[PDB]
Amino acid sequence: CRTSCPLALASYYLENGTTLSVINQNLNSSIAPYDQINFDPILRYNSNIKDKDRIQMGSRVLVPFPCECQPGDFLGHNFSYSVRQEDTYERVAISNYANLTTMESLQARNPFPATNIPLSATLNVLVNCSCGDESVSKDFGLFVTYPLRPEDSLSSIARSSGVSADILQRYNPGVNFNSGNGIVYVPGRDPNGAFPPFKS
Ligand SMILES: *[C@@H]1O[C@H](CO)[C@@H](O[C@@H]2O[C@H](CO)[C@@H](O[C@@H]3O[C@H](CO)[C@@H](O)[C@H](O)[C@@H]3O)[C@H](O)[C@H]2NC(C)=O)[C@H](O)[C@H]1NC(C)=O
Ligand SMILES: *[C@@H]1O[C@H](CO)[C@@H](O[C@@H]2O[C@H](CO)[C@@H](O)[C@H](O)[C@H]2NC(C)=O)[C@H](O)[C@H]1NC(C)=O
Ligand SMILES: *[C@@H]1O[C@H](CO)[C@@H](O[C@@H]2O[C@H](CO)[C@@H](O)[C@H](O)[C@H]2NC(C)=O)[C@H](O)[C@H]1NC(C)=O
Ligand SMILES: *[C@@H]1O[C@H](CO)[C@@H](O[C@@H]2O[C@H](CO)[C@@H](O)[C@H](O)[C@H]2NC(C)=O)[C@H](O)[C@H]1NC(C)=O
Ligand SMILES: *[C@@H]1O[C@H](CO)[C@@H](O)[C@H](O)[C@H]1NC(C)=O
């Protein structure tokens, strides 16, 4: 890979009842180790969360995770997921991982036929990330993998991220930020609200 960085952030949209524990379980990693007791690694990136035990539907939770070079020379991370009753690749992608992965990606990289995924199988779940692009800006080196929703637009994400629309578009060239699907990469802040800069 041409770029590298020590972490990325995943944007997990809340619907149908998701708790912080389930997010931490699904997105467990060395960077956010799930122990059911200490959620500080996640909470540091979400100062807006007043009560970790009662999170608000319709909001997004930012989760830090490692951002590693993958075969095929792109950046991402392999999460692991223990299969539960009635899981399907579609449901795991759209619901359990909140569009941070795709059903096609899951099906390609796991050996279970779509119609036979047994209880307690483990899935390899790929979520992509970015470390930035020096030709766009030297000012950003931490990125949110942000699945687009119908309510998002370039202007709304620019406003909420505090990053200019032109910079956002240059990081995501040719991508319509109002399309309501797929992922865009948005510069993110450290726990104190500063943007970590790009690092070669
Ligand atoms: C994330 O998980 C995936 C799936 O378990 C890992 O995938 C695979 O990685 C290995 C190399 O680490 C690749 O095996 C290699 O295959 C090539 C040719 O196919 C062969 O010449 C090598 O000797 C080696 O056996 C495999 O192709 C690759 N598969 C895919 C789908 O990309 C991946 O490595 C994990 N990422 C990390 C950072 O560990
Ligand atoms: C969360 O993910 C991490 C990273 O994959 C897991 O880390 C392993 O932890 C065991 C026991 O502490 C170590 O022996 C391994 O060396 C770690 N693996 C790696 C690759 O670092 C961790 O166990 C996971 N936690 C849960 C609840 O699944
Ligand atoms: C992941 O994306 C899917 C597809 O856009 C979202 O599910 C759609 O949600 C709308 C309601 O908002 C429904 O009308 C569609 O029928 C759904 N499509 C499918 C295929 O189920 C889903 O909400 C997204 N997940 C998250 C957590 O945001
Ligand atoms: C993560 O990024 C990789 C690399 O761009 C994506 O992999 C490609 O996926 C497309 C569509 O399925 C395939 O046509 C290509 O063969 C893949 N390229 C490589 C190098 O594997 C991948 O789809 C992205 N994953 C997610 C979950 O967004
Ligand atoms: C939420 O539940 C409804 C009703 O079952 C379903 O249509 C929708 O797909 C669910 N959303 C997610 C994220 O799976």
Amino acid identity, position 92: V
152 Cα–ligand 5 center, Å? 19
Amino acid identity, position 24: N
Task: Please tell me the distance from the alpha carbon of residue 179 to that of residue 11, in angstroms, as a whole number.
Answer: 17
Q: Give the residue, out of 7, 29, 30, with the most ligand 2 atoms within 8 A of its beta carbon, to mutate for a pocket test.
A: 30
- Nearest ligand 2 atom to alpha carbon 25: 27
Residue nearest atom 3 in ligand 3 by C-alpha distance:
94
In the numeric block, the tokens 């944007």 are attached to: 11
Tell me, in Å, the resolution of the deposited structure. 1.6
Backbone phi, psi, residue 75, to 5°: -100, 135
Experimental method: X-ray
- Nearest ligand 2 atom to alpha carbon 33: 1
Task: Please tell me the distance from the alpha carbon of residue 146 to that of residue 174, in angstroms, as a whole number.
Answer: 16
How many domains is the chain partitioned into structurally?
1
Q: Which residues are annotated as a binding site for chitin?
A: 85-91, 113-119
User: In which domain, by residue range, is 36 found?
Assistant: 1-200
Tokens encoding 85: 């009753």
Strand-pair partners of 126: 78
Task: Please tell me the distance from the alpha carbon of residue 168 to that of residue 177, in angstroms, as a whole number.
Answer: 9
In 3D space, the residue among 92, 99, 187 whose CA is nearest the CA of residue 144 turns out to be 187
Q: Which residues are annotated as a binding site?
A: 85-91, 113-119
